[PDB]
Q: What sequence folds into this?
DNA sequence: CTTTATTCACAAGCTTGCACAATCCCTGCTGGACAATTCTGAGTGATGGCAGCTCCCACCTTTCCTTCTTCCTTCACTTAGACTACATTTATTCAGCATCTGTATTGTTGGAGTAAGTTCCATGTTAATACTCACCACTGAGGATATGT
DNA sequence: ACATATCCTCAGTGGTGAGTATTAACATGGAACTTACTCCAACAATACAGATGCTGAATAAATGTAGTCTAAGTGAAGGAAGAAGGAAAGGTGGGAGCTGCCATCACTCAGAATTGTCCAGCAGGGATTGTGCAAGCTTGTGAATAAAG
C-alpha cells in the first residue's frame, strides 16, 4: 500500500530518465553489470519499469538502479 | 452489464431541432428495440415511440408524429432521437430504454435521460400517494381502460433518477428485484404489493401497459416512508 | 542495402503459412481471452488445457476460412486488398 | 481471482496477419484488424456459451474438451482430434 | 464351440459385436436386425481403409513413414467425394491446402 | 481404479497395416481417425433410425443401413461402400 | 376415480399426454420423467402462441381477419430471434420480405 | 371396411389462436405451416435432450434435460421466456 | 410410357426474370439464364435423387410429398406446409 | 410516344413480385422438367401433385435466395446488373461448389 | 448416359504439336479424373497419364513426361491433350477414359479414340492367343511383376473399337457386364474366366494394373469363336 | 593447387568465348537446359565465371560448359 | 528507355543423435460369443378404392422475335496515400518446477420415481353441414413519371 | 424555378362461392390405479490436475521511416439490356374414363431379444525402439540492383 506507490513513482522517474538520455534497457542492464558487477537482462529492466515482479525482488533491485540514476546525471 | 449511454442536458431556443444519442453496449444491439419516452412534471411519463435496429423499423406515438423521428446507426450501436420545432412544452426528460421484440418483455433497462429545456388506453392508479412505516404492506392498483392480456409492467423511479423495472407481465419479477415486490392481476385489474417497507422504497411507482399499439403509462403513485 | 518489393514477402509468407500446420496465435493471450469471455456466463469455472486447445483450433480454422472467403470477395471486387466490406459480405452470404 | 478486463488486444496485428496469410491474403487493409477481433469475439462467445451450458448441465465446474466439441458440433462446426 | 468372433465370420477387422452393442444402446431403434452391424462395420472399415491409404500415399510423397494429421487433411481435401463428405469438419493440426489465387502472383 | 474407455485405435491400426504394411500413425492422427469413425457411425445410425421411423418399423436392418449409406455418402463412395457391405453380409450369412 | 387430464392439470392447451407418448415412442431415451412432457408442451405452446400472435398482428395491419402463410412469413422474418430460429426453414406460399437495396433506388 | 385417422396439432393451435386472437381465423395452409413448425421444434428439442442424456450417461429425459435443450436451441429472450413458461407449467403440474 | 427431353428450356427467360425480381435484382445480364438453368438442374437433381431413394426404400412406385420433405430436410432446407 | 425509363419499370416489377406469394415458374413445364429429371433414377415413377408442388416451392425459394446473394455480390463489385460470376461467387461462398 | 466425345483422325507433319479434346457429358465432371492412354499395334497400350479436374491435378507417365501435357476446361467440361514435337513413332490411337478418384475404381468409360498419324511393374499374359469354339471354358492369366493388392481390371476390345471394361478390382463385374465373365486371384496372380462363348466374344482381352504410379497394361490375348 | 589454376584458366576461356559469341549468361543456361535437359540458373553460370562456387561444384560443372564450348564453335 | 550480369536473401537437399513418442508386451476384467428359450415384428397374400395418369377442348394470357433507345459497364490515365518491408527497441510468451487445494472420480444405499398391465371413458378425427371473409368487376383519388416550359 | 398528360397503385362499393367453422358418431388413446424394479441423488474418501508464482531464455510485437503500387476517381465509347409492339403458342382449368398401386387386415414364422456362463479380446500401464526433427553445411534459385547497348 505504501511500498507500491513509491515503487511506481520511482519506476516512472526511471523510465523518464532513460528516455531523456536516450539509453536503452539493454544498455541500462549492461551499465549496471559494468558498475556493480551483476549484469541484468533487458527483460529484467522492462519488467522493473512495468512493476511486473514481486515486491521482494523490487525492493532488492531498487538501490542499484537508484545508484545508476544518480550516477548517470553527471556521467 | 447492459448500459444505455446518453448525452447531457440541452438548452435550446424554440423553432430549431435537437438530436440526442442512445449509445448502447453489453448486448446484441440488433436483437432489441430501443424505445423512447418523455417525462414532464405536468403529465408525467408518456411513450414517444420505438425503433428496431434489426430492420430499422420504427413506430411512433400518434401525438408525436412529425415532432419526433428515430434513426439507427448499427456501426456505432447508437440510436438517435430528433425533435423538430421545439415549442415551449418540449422541455422534459427524454429517456431511452431497451425492450426485447418478445411481446411479454418490457422496458427492462433505461438510460440516464437527457433534460431538454426550450428557451387509446387510459391506465388508472387509484392511490395517488400514501405514507407508510417500515414494516407493513403496500398495495397499488392500476385499473385499465381496455383489456390487456397481462401485458403490464411496474417501474419504480427515485427522484432525479431513471426508472427501474420491478415487474413485467404483471406477475414476473425483474432481474435482480427481490421477492419483496409482488405483482398480481389480469385483464383490466392489476395490483402491485410491497411486503415490508425500507428506507429506499420512497419513490414514484408507475404502471405501464404495452398490450396495444400506443403504450400508456400510469399516473404515478408517490410512496413516502415513515 | 537490399529490400524486397512489396508483395514478395507477403507471397513468401502465404506459401510458408500454407505449408505449415501449427497454431498462429500465442497460447497465453488466447487463454486469457477465453477465460474472460467465459467469466461473463459462469463466475468461477476452470478450464481443461485440451478445452482451450480445441477452442484455439476451432477459432483459427474459422478465421482462416473466413479470410479465404474475404479474399474471394476482394478479388471479385477487382482488388488485392481485403477490406471490412469484404468480410461483411462473406459473413452475410454465409448466413452469419 | 482477477477480473481479466480487455484482453481482445492480445490477438495482435501480426497474429491476424499470419491468419490472413494462411488464408491466402496478400494485402490487408488497416481496418481489417478491429473487424477480425470483433468477428472472433462473437464466434468465441457463441461457442463458449454452449460449452458453459453443457458444463453446467453436467453439474461440473470445469470446462472439458468434450464440452467444447459438443458445442462446436452443434453449431455445424464439427472438430476432429479431441475425443 | 471355441467362440469365434462375428468380425472373423464377416471377414472384417472392425468389431461387429461392438458395433452391435453401440447400435443397441444408442437409442436408434427398438431392435437391431443382426446384419445391420455387419453392414455397418463393413462400411466403416471401407471408409477407414480408403482414408488411411490416401493418407499413407500422401506421407510417401512427403517422404515420411508416419501418418500425421496433415496427411489426413491432404487426403481428404484433395478428393471430391471425401471433401464433400467432410465439408463441415475441422481436422486439428491439419492446416490448409496450398492455394494462391492466380491474380495475386507477380506480373 | 480409473475407468476404462474404448476407442477404434486397434482396428484402425489393423486396417492401416493391411493397406500400408510399413507406414505408422501418430497419436493425433489416431484421434482424428477415431473422431471420423465415430462421426460416420453417428451419421449412418441416425439416418437409419429416421428411415426405420418413417416406415413404421421397429427394427434397423441391413436394408436401412444400405439406404442410409446411399443417402449420406457421395456417388462412387456410396457405391463401393454398398458393395463392401453386401459382400460382408453375404460372407457372414454364408458362414456357420 | 375421475377427470383432470394432464394438460388441464398443468394449465396448458397443448396435449401433455400426446407429447409424453411421442417422447416414449420417439426413440429418445430409455425412460421419460413426468415433468419432461409438461415442460415441453409448455415450451411448444409458448412458441406457438408467440408466432400466432405476431402473425395475427401482421394480419390485423393488413385489413384482413385471417392468418395466411404470408402473415406467418412476415412475423418470422421480421424478428431477430425468430428468424434465427427458423433461419433454415422455407415457408410454403410465404413469399419474401419487401427489401430493395439502397443503391438500386433512383436519384 | 378400412380406416383413415391422421393426427396433428391443429386442434390445439386453434385453441391458442383463440386465446391470443379471439376474433381471427386461420387458413388451412397456415394450419399446415403451424403443424410443421410444432413438429420441427418438437424433434429439435427432443433430439437435443436425448443427446444431453446420452452425454451424461443417463437413461432418462427429465425436465432438466428439456430446460437445457431449450437453452441451447432457442435464442436469448426466446429461451428465457420459454424456460419461464416451462418452469411455471411444471410447478403448477406438481401441485395438484 | 413416354420419354421426356429438353424440358429445361421450359424454365423460360421471363420466369427467371420474375425470380430475379423477387430477389430484388434490377438489371440482368444475358448469360444469367443458362447459369440459372444449370443451378436449378443441379439442385433439382440432388433433391429428386434423395426423394427417389426415400421412395425406393419404402417399396413404393409413387413419390410422395413426405419423401420430398425428407430429402429437403436431409439437405438442410426444411420446408413447412407439406406434411410432417 | 411515351416510354418508361430503364430501371423505373424494373423497380415496380421488384415491388410487385416482392409483395405477391404465388409461384413464378409455370406449373406444367416445371412438372415436365421434374419428371424428366426423375426418369434418370427410376423408370415408371409417379408423383403426387403435392410432391411436385413441394419441389416447386423449394426450388423457387432456393432460386430467390440465390438471386438475393447474387445481387449482393453484384453490388459489392459496384454494378447493378447481375452476371454469372456473381452467381458463381455466391455459390462458392455458400459452400455449394 | 456417360460418354467421352473425341475428335477425328489427325494427319500431322513431324515436329508440330496437336490438341486432342475429350468432351465429357452425363456425369459430374469435377468428381472423376480423365485418363489418357495410347495404343499402337507394335506395343499395345500404354497409360499416358491423367488429370483431375477438381483441383486440376495431373500425373504423367515417366516416358511421356514433357511429351504430353494435359489441361482441363471446367466451363465446357473438356480435357485437352497436347502432343509436342511429334515424331513418326507416335502414329497411334489415343483414347481418353474416365476413372473415379476412388482407388478401387478403374477406367470404366472410354472415348472413341483419335488416330494420330505422323507423315515399373510388368503384366504378363500367358496365352498370346487362344482358339475356342462356341461352348467351352476360357481362362486367361495376368501374372504381375510386383504385388498389387487386387487393383487389377480386365478389358475387352473389338477391332477398331474402344476397349470395354469387364472386371474391376480383380473380382467385381463392370456395370452392365453379364455374370458369365468372372475374375479371380490376388497379389501377383490374376485370372479371367469366360463361361460359354458367344460370337461376339472374338476380341482382344487386356489386363491393367492401377496399384502403382505408372499404370501398366498386359500384352493382350486374342480370342475368336469357331 | 592444381585444380584451381586449371579452373581459373577454363573460366577465363568461357568468359572470353561468351564475350566473343555475344551470348548472355542466361542464354548459356537455357542452352545447357536444351542440349542436356538440366536447366541451370544464370546465377550458377556467373558464379562459375567469378569462381565463387565450391571446387567440387566447379569440377562437376566443368564438362558441361566444355561440351557447350565445343558445340558453340560450329552451331 | 531494354536487356543483362553481379549481388543478395532464402528455402531446399544432405548428414548425424537423440529423446519424444510410437510400438509392443503383460495382466486382469469385462464384454462378446454359445446356447436354449421366449417373444414378438414383419414378410406374404387378398381387398377396396382413391388418386395418378391419359385425353379433348377452348381461351386468353404468356412467351417469343424485332427494332430502336439509353445508360451501364469497361477500359485508359492519373495520383494521393496507405499499405509493405525492415531495423531497432521493447515486452510478452514459453518452458520447467513447486504448492496447493478445489473439484472430478469411485463406492454403496436405498428411496423416489418410472415402467408395465387393466379398465374405461372422455376426447380428437372424420363426415355432414351453414354461413362468411376475401377475390373479380368497376369507379375513383393521389401521387409516380417522362416530357416540355 | 415551373406544368402536364400517362400509365401505375391503393380505396372502397356487391355478389358470391371456396373455404372455414359448427354439430353428431365413435373409437381409441390418455387417465386412474396398483405393483415391480431400478436409477440416480446423497454422502464420503481421495487423488489429481488446474490455478498460481518464479525465473530466465526465446520469441515476438510495437515503432518509426522510406517508398512503391494500388485503390479510387474521371472521362469516353460502345454495346448490351430493356421497353414496346405484334404474332404465336401453349398453360390452365374443366370434364370425363381407367386402372395401378397405396393403404388396411390378418396370420404365422422366422428372426431378434433374454438370460446365464465363461473365456479371450482389449484397455491400462510399463519397457523398448526408431522416426523425424534440431542443427550445421552446401547449393541452386528467384528477386532485385548495377551496367551495357
A:
Amino acid at each position: 500500500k505504501a511500498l507500491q506507490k513509491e515503487l511506481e513513482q520511482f519506476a516512472k522517474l526511471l523510465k523518464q530518465k532513460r528516455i531523456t538520455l536516450g539509453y536503452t534497457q539493454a544498455d541500462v542492464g549492461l551499465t549496471l553489470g559494468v558498475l556493480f558487477g551483476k549484469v541484468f537482462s533487458q527483460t529484467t529492466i522492462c519488467r522493473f519499469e512495468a512493476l511486473q515482479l514481486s515486491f521482494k525482488n523490487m525492493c532488492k533491485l531498487r538501490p542499484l538502479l537508484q545508484k545508476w540514476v544518480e550516477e548517470a546525471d553527471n556521467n | 452489464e447492459v448500459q444505455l449511454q446518453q448525452s447531457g442536458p440541452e438548452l435550446v431556443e424554440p423553432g430549431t431541432s435537437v438530436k440526442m444519442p442512445c449509445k448502447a453496449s453489453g448486448y446484441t444491439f440488433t436483437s432489441y428495440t430501443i424505445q423512447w419516452v418523455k417525462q414532464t412534471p405536468r403529465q408525467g411519463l408518456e411513450w414517444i415511440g420505438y425503433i428496431y435496429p434489426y430492420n430499422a423499423g420504427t413506430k411512433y406515438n400518434e401525438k408525436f408524429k412529425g415532432k419526433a423521428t428515430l434513426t439507427s446507426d448499427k456501426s456505432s450501436s447508437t440510436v438517435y432521437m430528433e425533435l423538430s420545432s421545439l415549442t415551449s412544452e418540449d422541455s422534459a426528460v427524454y429517456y431511452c430504454a431497451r425492450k426485447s421484440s418478445r411481446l411479454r418483455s418490457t422496458l427492462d433497462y433505461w438510460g440516464q435521460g437527457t433534460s431538454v429545456t426550450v428557451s387509446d388506453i387510459k391506465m388508472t392508479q387509484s392511490p395517488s400517494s400514501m405514507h407508510a412505516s417500515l414494516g407493513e404492506r403496500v398495495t397499488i392498483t392500476c385499473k385499465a381502460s381496455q383489456d390487456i392480456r397481462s401485458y403490464l409492467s411496474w417501474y419504480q423511479q427515485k427522484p432525479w433518477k431513471s426508472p427501474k423495472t420491478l415487474i413485467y407481465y404483471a406477475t414476473s419479477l425483474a432481474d435482480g428485484v427481490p421477492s419483496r415486490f409482488s405483482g398480481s392481476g389480469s385483464g383490466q385489474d392489476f395490483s402491485l404489493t410491497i411486503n415490508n417497507l425500507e428506507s429506499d422504497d420512497t419513490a414514484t411507482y408507475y404502471c405501464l401497459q404495452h398490450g396495444e399499439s400506443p403504450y400508456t403509462f400510469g399516473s404515478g403513485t408517490k410512496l413516502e416512508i415513515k | 542495402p537490399h529490400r524486397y518489393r512489396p508483395g514478395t514477402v507477403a507471397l513468401r509468407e502465404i506459401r510458408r503459412y500454407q505449408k505449415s500446420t501449427e497454431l498462429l496465435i500465442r497460447k497465453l493471450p488466447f487463454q486469457r481471452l477465453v477465460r474472460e469471455i467465459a467469466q461473463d456466463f459462469k463466475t468461477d469455472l476452470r478450464f481443461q488445457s485440451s478445452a482451450v486447445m480445441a477452442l484455439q483450433e476451432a477459432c483459427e480454422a474459422y478465421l482462416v476460412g473466413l479470410f479465404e472467403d474475404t479474399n474471394l470477395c476482394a478479388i471479385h471486387a477487382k482488388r488485392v486488398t481485403i477490406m471490412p466490406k469484404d468480410i461483411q459480405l462473406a459473413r452475410r452470404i454465409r448466413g452469419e | 481471482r482477477k477480473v481479466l478486463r480487455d484482453n481482445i488486444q492480445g490477438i495482435t496485428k501480426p497474429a491476424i496477419r499470419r491468419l490472413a496469410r494462411r488464408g491466402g491474403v496478400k494485402r490487408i487493409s488497416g481496418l481489417i484488424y478491429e473487424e477480425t477481433r470483433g468477428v472472433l469475439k462473437v464466434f468465441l462467445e457463441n461457442v463458449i456459451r454452449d460449452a458453459v451450458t453443457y458444463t453446467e448441465h453436467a453439474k461440473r465446474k470445469t470446462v472439458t474438451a468434450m464440452d467444447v466439441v459438443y458445442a462446436l458440433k452443434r453449431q455445424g462446426r464439427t472438430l476432429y482430434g479431441f475425443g | 464351440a471355441k467362440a469365434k468372433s462375428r468380425s472373423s465370420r464377416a471377414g472384417l477387422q472392425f468389431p461387429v459385436g461392438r458395433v452391435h452393442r453401440l447400435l443397441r444402446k444408442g437409442n436408434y431403434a427398438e431392435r437391431v436386425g443382426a446384419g445391420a452391424p455387419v453392414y455397418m462395420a463393413a462400411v466403416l472399415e471401407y471408409l477407414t481403409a480408403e482414408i488411411l491409404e490416401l493418407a499413407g500415399n500422401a506421407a510417401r510423397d512427403n517422404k515420411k513413414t508416419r501418418i500425421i494429421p496433415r496427411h489426413l487433411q491432404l487426403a481428404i481435401r484433395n478428393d471430391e467425394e471425401l471433401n464433400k463428405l467432410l465439408g463441415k469438419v475441422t481436422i486439428a493440426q491439419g492446416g490448409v491446402l496450398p492455394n494462391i489465387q492466380a491474380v495475386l502472383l507477380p506480373k | 481404479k480409473r475407468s476404462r474407455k474404448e476407442s477404434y485405435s486397434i482396428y484402425v491400426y489393423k486396417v492401416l497395416k493391411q493397406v500400408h504394411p510399413d507406414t505408422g500413425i501418430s497419436s493425433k492422427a489416431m484421434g482424428i481417425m477415431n473422431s471420423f469413425v465415430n462421426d460416420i457411425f453417428e451419421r449412418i445410425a441416425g439416418e437409419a433410425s429416421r428411415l426405420a421411423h418413417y416406415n413404421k418399423r421397429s427394427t434397423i436392418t441391413s436394408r436401412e443401413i444400405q439406404t442410409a449409406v446411399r443417402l449420406l455418402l457421395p456417388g462412387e463412395l456410396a457405391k463401393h461402400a454398398v458393395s463392401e457391405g453386401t459382400k460382408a453380409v453375404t460372407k457372414y450369412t454364408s458362414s456357420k
Q: What stands out?
A: Chain F has one domain: 9-94.
